Design a protein around this ligand. Sequence first.
Ligand SMILES: [Mg+2]
Ligand SMILES: [Mg+2]
Ligand SMILES: [Mg+2]
Ligand SMILES: [Mg+2]
Ligand SMILES: [Mg+2]
Ligand SMILES: [Mg+2]
Ligand SMILES: [Mg+2]
Ligand SMILES: [Mg+2]
Ligand SMILES: [Mg+2]
Ligand SMILES: [Mg+2]
Ligand SMILES: [Mg+2]
Ligand SMILES: [Mg+2]
Ligand SMILES: [Mg+2]
Ligand SMILES: [Mg+2]
Ligand SMILES: [Mg+2]
Ligand SMILES: [Mg+2]
Ligand SMILES: [Mg+2]
Ligand SMILES: [Mg+2]
Ligand SMILES: [Mg+2]
Ligand SMILES: [Mg+2]
Ligand SMILES: [Mg+2]
Ligand SMILES: [Mg+2]
Ligand SMILES: [Mg+2]
Ligand SMILES: [Mg+2]
Ligand SMILES: [Mg+2]
Ligand SMILES: [Mg+2]
Ligand SMILES: [Mg+2]
Ligand SMILES: [Mg+2]
Ligand SMILES: [Mg+2]
Ligand SMILES: [Mg+2]
Ligand SMILES: [Mg+2]
Ligand SMILES: [Mg+2]
Ligand SMILES: [Mg+2]
Ligand SMILES: [Mg+2]
Ligand SMILES: [Mg+2]
Ligand SMILES: [Mg+2]
Ligand SMILES: [Mg+2]
Ligand SMILES: [Mg+2]
Ligand SMILES: [Mg+2]
Ligand SMILES: [Mg+2]
Ligand SMILES: [Mg+2]
Ligand SMILES: [Mg+2]
Ligand SMILES: [Mg+2]
Ligand SMILES: [Mg+2]
Ligand SMILES: [Mg+2]
Ligand SMILES: [Mg+2]
Ligand SMILES: [Mg+2]
Lengths: 99, 193, 203, 51, 148
Amino acid sequence: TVKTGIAIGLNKGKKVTSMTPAPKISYKKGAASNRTKFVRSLVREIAGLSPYERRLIDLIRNSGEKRARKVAKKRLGSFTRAKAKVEEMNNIIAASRRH
Amino acid sequence: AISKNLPILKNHFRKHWQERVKVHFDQAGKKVSRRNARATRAAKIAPRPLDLLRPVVRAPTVKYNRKVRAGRGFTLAEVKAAGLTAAYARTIGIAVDHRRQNRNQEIFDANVQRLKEYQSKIIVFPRNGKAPEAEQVLSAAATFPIAQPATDVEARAVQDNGESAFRTLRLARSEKKFRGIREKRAREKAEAE
Amino acid sequence: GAYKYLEELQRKKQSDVLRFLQRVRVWEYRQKNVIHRAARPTRPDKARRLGYKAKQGFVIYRVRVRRGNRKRPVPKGATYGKPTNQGVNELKYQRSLRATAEERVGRRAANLRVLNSYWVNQDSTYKYFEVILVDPQHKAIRRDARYNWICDPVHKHREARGLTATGKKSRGINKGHKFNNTKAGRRKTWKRQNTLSLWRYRK
Amino acid sequence: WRKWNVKVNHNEKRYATASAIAATAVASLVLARGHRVEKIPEIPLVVSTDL
Amino acid sequence: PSRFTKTRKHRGHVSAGKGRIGKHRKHPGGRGMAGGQHHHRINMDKYHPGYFGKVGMRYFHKQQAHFWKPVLNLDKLWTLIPEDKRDQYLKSASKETAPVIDTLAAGYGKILGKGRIPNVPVIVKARFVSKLAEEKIRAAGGVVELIA
RNA sequence: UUGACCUCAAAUCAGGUAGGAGUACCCGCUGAACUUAAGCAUAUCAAUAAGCGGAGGAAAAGAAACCAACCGGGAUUGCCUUAGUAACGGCGAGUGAAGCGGCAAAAGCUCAAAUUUGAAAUCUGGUACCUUCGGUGCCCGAGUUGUAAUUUGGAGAGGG
RNA sequence: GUUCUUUGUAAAGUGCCUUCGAAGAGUCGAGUUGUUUGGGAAUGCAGCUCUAAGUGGGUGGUAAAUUCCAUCUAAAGCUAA
RNA sequence: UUGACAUUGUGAAGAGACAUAGUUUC
Ligand SMILES: [Mg+2]
Ligand SMILES: [Mg+2]
Ligand SMILES: [Mg+2]
Ligand SMILES: [Mg+2]
Ligand SMILES: [Mg+2]
Ligand SMILES: [Mg+2]
Ligand SMILES: [Mg+2]
Ligand SMILES: [Mg+2]
Ligand SMILES: [Mg+2]
Ligand SMILES: [Mg+2]
Ligand SMILES: [Mg+2]
Ligand SMILES: [Mg+2]
Ligand SMILES: [Mg+2]
Ligand SMILES: [Mg+2]
Ligand SMILES: [Mg+2]
Ligand SMILES: [Mg+2]
Ligand SMILES: [Mg+2]
Ligand SMILES: [Mg+2]
Ligand SMILES: [Mg+2]
Ligand SMILES: [Mg+2]
Ligand SMILES: [Mg+2]
Ligand SMILES: [Mg+2]
Ligand SMILES: [Mg+2]
Ligand SMILES: [Mg+2]
Ligand SMILES: [Mg+2]
Ligand SMILES: [Mg+2]
Ligand SMILES: [Mg+2]
Ligand SMILES: [Mg+2]
Ligand SMILES: [Mg+2]
Ligand SMILES: [Mg+2]
Ligand SMILES: [Mg+2]
Ligand SMILES: [Mg+2]
Ligand SMILES: [Mg+2]
Ligand SMILES: [Mg+2]
Ligand SMILES: [Mg+2]
Ligand SMILES: [Mg+2]
Ligand SMILES: [Mg+2]
Ligand SMILES: [Mg+2]
Ligand SMILES: [Mg+2]
Ligand SMILES: [Mg+2]
Ligand SMILES: [Mg+2]
Ligand SMILES: [Mg+2]
Ligand SMILES: [Mg+2]
Ligand SMILES: [Mg+2]
Ligand SMILES: [Mg+2]
Ligand SMILES: [Mg+2]
Ligand SMILES: [Mg+2]
């Protein structure tokens, strides 16, 4: 950053010789891991797809990604998960029934 | 039920409020007990003081950051620089706060220095047995008063380059205000073919 | 270990392997009594992560609670009052099915202490639960510094007071701007904001 | 919850205690007050610290 | 105290000083602020014009603190220097050494310009300034240094 | 034929535990109307009374899926204040909290998810002895569908 | 304060290098109904339908798409004043 | 009372689309 040292404006605020702390591991609560990557990969090919997931990829191959998001947003919570879910499908497809 | 030129009141007394009246008839009582409590603790607590060493901290929000004020505990970094682990620092009557975070060196130094002064002015009786009687100072806080850092000098030369301060604020206000719009002209003019 | 596989597998409830499993088990349970002792967790990885332990002193109970809304008792729907209160049929119950389940085994094992409870299955009519319990008079438990807290009397019928996880959920106990009403404990924080504080030297 | 105690402004409270101290000299006042002080040396009456 | 009170005086007169005709009854006009728009409108418009209905913007979760910003006018300003020290600076009005006044440190957030300060140079440290304040300050050979 | 295991039973089986009471204060459920609005239905009374389940000497809450937007604070509880304010409201009668700041008190932590795998290292009980709120030996039993050690995000683990 | 057994070929703290770093699901979340709250395109709670991810997830008191930023680490648990 | 969703699974003929291979729907 660096603050401007005045009391309104863009990088508003008092100038302080600054420090940048050490990082909390509690900030990496999302991070993968080779262990969980491995497992999740494994479980998937055991249990396969699920009903709404089948409808997704077929909907992708037969109507495009935008119609898939729109559905998948309804199916899941929301547009952001739907984004992710469609992607995930796109990659079941590419990885498998392709290369 | 409305008359004269009176100010409109709002006395919220339409629930069974008489059932929830607290009179501190016990104000004098609690003071005593509070005091008795403290006298009893000072005893039990042997020569230790009644409180922990607390860090200096700049206060939050626009309204209070001119003031500095006792924080909770010292931060894993400050304790480290101060030459001790926190496991121990805790057994030595230093409060340590694993969630507070250093981002400001002035305060950081202040606190480490607070720990140095503390460490040097305390004395830690051996585990053993001997217990070499040494009498209690009751307040870590009284002993080591948190004070407001001096930010300038009383008097000093005048330097006027000319730029209105006022108009500087005006201008700064402005830049932020149109930061977004100008970024859209910057995008929109980049898309010129 | 296996437990990480169990965990992940169980997040695929609509998967072919899981819904076979689910349909069979839900038939079995419905044949058994509405409260019945369980031999063992059917979700060992779940139980485990909630406090379960394979030593004498831990009990598991399976229980059914009927689904749906709470039909307001009242004869013939008659409510006798203002119309805001004339409702009878979209009324929902503030505690949770899960909570009823803890409560009904709780009573069935008064000698026990409810620790926690997990969902296992449902159908149109019932939600099924496994409640994990502790025996506080069991010596295996009274020793063990980790669980003997449960042996204290302040934890008598924690399910009946909403002090189990479900209880604390519905009780609104969380930190933050979203929980002001319900957090120090709604009724208590109410009473607070409606107490009139008068000092000897009136302020 | 009737009001039993009463606030006086600290300063005025002093104005009074001060006043009352001032009238502990002023023999007429003392005399008029009960207080049998006709046959005392002088007023204020100051007695040895040894007391 | 009760002894000084007019009900003591009314004892023995029938109607407690509230009329034989029109009594003292429970709530004749209704309770509270009832009828504001009806039988109590003459008292409301006149005495409380403005009462009913709305103006401006709602502001959800307004935090007075955000807007903290006390004003100090030039009108004082020299007050924020201790007396002793003050007289010492008035005489010897000068660049090279002029007093520094942290007005934030005195807990004000804006200097405004009410009215005349002697020609002594001040160095004035503030979060905000009116145009005039900062003008009048320079006219004494001081400046405003913007802090935070 | 013999012996297991899983699951389910029985006993005046060996030892224990729950009930009821009290309920000022505490944790939940459930849940009014009189009343106020000068009428009245939303509102209000009130998340109140009555009904139900559950604790303790306090209960509950508690070491942040927090507050913030600052030069950032730092478990929870409570007092002073914020404030009759932001806000809600036939925007009517009415209602109505929070962050910051001062103060009382202070305190911190445990699991789950990990191969001990060169050695289930853990534990109920019976029993004989003892220096009996327990220890030791031995024997059934529990437990690998995981009892200990180890680690808890502030980290922390394995190698050097 | 005394005094007896040394618990150990036991246990714990710290510095550097390296490789790692497992972190709670019919939950979070969403729709809808109803209740509740100062909480306003919805403050909490519940029922039914849908139902996640791991550079993820929650919150950021005006709905939405886009792009960043800040800030914690839920769905398990104990604790005096 | 009427509809949708959930409880809800298995074959078969017939309609219906990527636009006359069979995943999917009545
Ligand atoms: Mg009141
Ligand atoms: Mg009333
Ligand atoms: Mg009292
Ligand atoms: Mg103290
Ligand atoms: Mg000793
Ligand atoms: Mg068993
Ligand atoms: Mg009724
Ligand atoms: Mg209603
Ligand atoms: Mg409220
Ligand atoms: Mg008064
Ligand atoms: Mg009076
Ligand atoms: Mg009198
Ligand atoms: Mg008289
Ligand atoms: Mg008279
Ligand atoms: Mg008379
Ligand atoms: Mg007369
Ligand atoms: Mg009169
Ligand atoms: Mg009369
Ligand atoms: Mg109004
Ligand atoms: Mg003035
Ligand atoms: Mg028997
Ligand atoms: Mg009872
Ligand atoms: Mg009610
Ligand atoms: Mg009444
Ligand atoms: Mg009325
Ligand atoms: Mg009337
Ligand atoms: Mg009427
Ligand atoms: Mg209501
Ligand atoms: Mg009652
Ligand atoms: Mg008792
Ligand atoms: Mg107490
Ligand atoms: Mg407690
Ligand atoms: Mg934590
Ligand atoms: Mg922070
Ligand atoms: Mg706090
Ligand atoms: Mg009003
Ligand atoms: Mg209310
Ligand atoms: Mg404070
Ligand atoms: Mg502790
Ligand atoms: Mg977690
Ligand atoms: Mg209700
Ligand atoms: Mg709602
Ligand atoms: Mg958004
Ligand atoms: Mg536990
Ligand atoms: Mg607790
Ligand atoms: Mg206790
Ligand atoms: Mg059925």
